[PDB]
Design a protein around this ligand. Structure first.
Ligand SMILES: Nc1nc2c(ncn2[C@@H]2O[C@H](COP(=O)(O)OP(=O)(O)OP(=O)(O)O)[C@@H](OP(=O)(O)OP(=O)(O)O)[C@H]2O)c(=O)[nH]1
Ligand SMILES: Nc1nc2c(ncn2[C@@H]2O[C@H](COP(=O)(O)OP(=O)(O)OP(=O)(O)O)[C@@H](OP(=O)(O)OP(=O)(O)O)[C@H]2O)c(=O)[nH]1
Ligand SMILES: Nc1nc2c(ncn2[C@@H]2O[C@H](COP(=O)(O)OP(=O)(O)OP(=O)(O)O)[C@@H](OP(=O)(O)OP(=O)(O)O)[C@H]2O)c(=O)[nH]1
Ligand SMILES: Nc1nc2c(ncn2[C@@H]2O[C@H](COP(=O)(O)OP(=O)(O)OP(=O)(O)O)[C@@H](OP(=O)(O)OP(=O)(O)O)[C@H]2O)c(=O)[nH]1
Ligand SMILES: [Fe+2]
Ligand SMILES: [Fe+2]
Lengths: 194, 197, 194, 197
């Protein structure tokens, strides 16, 4: 007795389009920046749209009506892209270059690089909106972007496996050990400049 | 003497324009399919004009050879070709794209309304989009050729012949296939319309 | 009370790998053939793995045990690739170039081009096996290949929509009208040779 | 005088070799992940040696300049770089690939067992595969560099410096990062192994 999967299938479709739109902006920046300064800020990107089960789960946790309309108006990380950068300073270069764009707007920002989480997690999280041009309408949609270095990706990926303690203490060691190395690398890369 | 190759810049920013249009096109195809359960775009092809082709074009229109002047005189530096499943898709794509805020129409030539002498049929529009570079916004024209499969079939073959080009023997016979393809693709369209009701 | 989705998810995984393997052989042929004769036989390819529902449905129709093992040993078109060619004669060039390969074996062949189906359908269907090299074993798997021209693809795609009559008679007209045009095209293309 | 560019042939068939190996690698990654719920390959990178690099290499080994002789003397014409998530993945990939019937091992140099003077670490193997061309079968060597992310991080940076190359100031300090990366990536591996039980 319902049609509830109609907006969710709809949901996934329009939010992937937002990822396609943002991915493009990112690639052109990386391309052009490299074309100007002989250096790629972006090592690579990853895109994912939240599974429906995670959406419904998340809606239930905050006690909200279970519909695509309500997920659409309450969940900002439905569409997610992860930008992995070669160097720390690249992270903030991308953030700047993306936000200054006309159709791109900043909604939420959390910088766990300056202020890592308790367990050691480091990463710049921003939510932006872009317009998505559909066959018969324009949707302005939020995309969640995680900007991190290779090192931050490495550590995050492992700590994440553990969620599915004894390792808490030892992970924090790696988190700073990685910070330490990537700054050596950053320092050396900088001295050569372009 | 000293590197006059500003074109590498040209090639760089105009290929970026193609990514932006291509992204737009792909989303229209995707969303229209999600709504009317049918993909208008069969596929797309993208190309940035060879520098060899540019200078030749500049030479022909009697223009100075610099990237700067090509940027403001050649609209088909960046080109994309949208091959559609059915005749009516050609005009759906045209409509869906123009209605987008950041797409601006510059030029339009409809060789479907008025096929060329040799039989060529195709819808040509030039649009502008903004390209967001690391340090500036460049607004660039992309030339878009919209056609059906048959029109594509025919075009690519005619291109091989003319582009020692004899034609001659085939001009007459190519024009026959051009019309024969039109006729059938209308049969196909007629049928497709009736069942999508 | 079962694990029946384990082999099916397994099934889809190993059969896509077969598609990756066959796709590659095809691309190298198209690439190299064009590199030698300045002409691409392949306009494009399409790959698809049968949905589980279609597999189960098909198993039920022939009254077979419902398991991935049994689908694996009875259904040859689990993995399918559709090679669309620019010209009719290209179809048989590809067939030859693919079958002569050491790791490629012909299992089933149906040529609806010489002998179209009653409704007008034209297409060369072959089933081949390739070995698929997995982490811990080698599977030899069947892939079903449909080789057709652009014209044949066009007609097929439309006739297919109709399955989901008045149009039967009129489709057959298009089927031969398309044959007629593509042969004109074939004739003209041939006269220029390479 | 007359087109000596047999290399375009060379570039053509060796890029075909990369497609065949790349396909193999991708399937191993996919299947291993399906079984042990973990991707060994983080990503891959492919490259066919620039002709500029080839002739230079031929010049250095004092060989005649022809595609024919390069074909039988240069094993790294086609090269692929497999970046892995964990140290142990490097050897899993090595093993899974060699056990394939049509992959034949030609050469092996393990700079992880024995890192170079400057700190470089990486597992180098040359394999042969058959390439099925339109009219023949060519058996070609591909050079494969297998490394962890950290080894990749470090390598790409060291490459920028040496490839006016000062090094000097950084050699010492690069070697420090090389060891610092090793140490941590073993911490990571140690932890990952314990939880995958
Ligand atoms: N590896 C790792 N990632 C962290 C950690 N803390 C945050 N993150 C990242 O932050 C992303 C969003 O998680 P949070 O915002 O912190 O919590 P949420 O459930 O999303 O509710 P909230 O957005 O805050 O309102 C995660 O998305 P994910 O899809 O990646 O995971 P996952 O899906 O498990 O989150 C992670 O990428 C951490 O301690 N370790
Ligand atoms: N096959 C074919 N195409 C035609 C014909 N008339 C126009 N076109 C297409 O229109 C595009 C440009 O032709 P025109 O606009 O009429 O002339 P211009 O663009 O000003 O100079 P230009 O053609 O680019 O050198 C071409 O793009 P291209 O990238 O394809 O090449 P190509 O352009 O070389 O033909 C053709 O594909 C025709 O009679 N046959
Ligand atoms: N458009 C069209 N295709 C036909 C027609 N006859 C055969 N085909 C193609 O042949 C493919 C396999 O269908 P068949 O072999 O004829 O019948 P099967 O159900 O597969 O059992 P069988 O293989 O013979 O033992 C189809 O796969 P599909 O995935 O494409 O469809 P679809 O999934 O509906 O088949 C079609 O691609 C036809 O009259 N029109
Ligand atoms: N960054 C770095 N790489 C090393 C080092 N030693 C070996 N390599 C890698 O090994 C590859 C070839 O180096 P060698 O095998 O030792 O020497 P040869 O292959 O015989 O000549 P060649 O290097 O190709 O000119 C390179 O491939 P490439 O494609 O990367 O370039 P590149 O090869 O230019 O270094 C390097 O990536 C090192 O000290 N630092
Ligand atoms: Fe855009
Ligand atoms: Fe193979």
């Amino acid at each position: 007795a319902f049609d509830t999967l109609l907006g969710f299938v709809e949901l996934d479709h329009i939010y992937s389009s937002a990822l396609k739109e943002i991915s493009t902006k990112l690639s052109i920046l990386d391309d052009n920046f490299n074309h100007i300064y002989k250096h790629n800020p972006i090592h690579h990107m990853e895109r994912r749209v939240k599974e429906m089960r995670s959406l419904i789960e998340k809606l239930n946790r905050k006690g909200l009506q279970i519909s695509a309309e309500t997920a659409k108006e309450h969940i900002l990380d439905i569409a997610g892209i992860r930008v992995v950068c070669n160097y720390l300073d690249d992270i903030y270069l991308i953030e700047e270059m993306l936000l200054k764009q006309e159709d791109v707007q900043l909604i939420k920002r959390k910088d766990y690089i300056q202020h890592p989480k308790e367990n050691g997690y480091r990463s710049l999280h921003i939510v932006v909106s872009i317009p998505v041009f559909l066959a018969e309408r324009v949707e302005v949609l939020p995309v969640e972007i995680q900007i991190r270095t290779i090192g931050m990706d490495m550590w995050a990926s492992l700590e994440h496996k553990i969620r599915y303690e004894k390792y808490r203490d030892l992970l924090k060691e790696c988190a700073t050990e990685i910070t330490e190395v990537e700054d050596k690398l950053q320092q050396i890369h900088s001295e050569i400049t372009e």
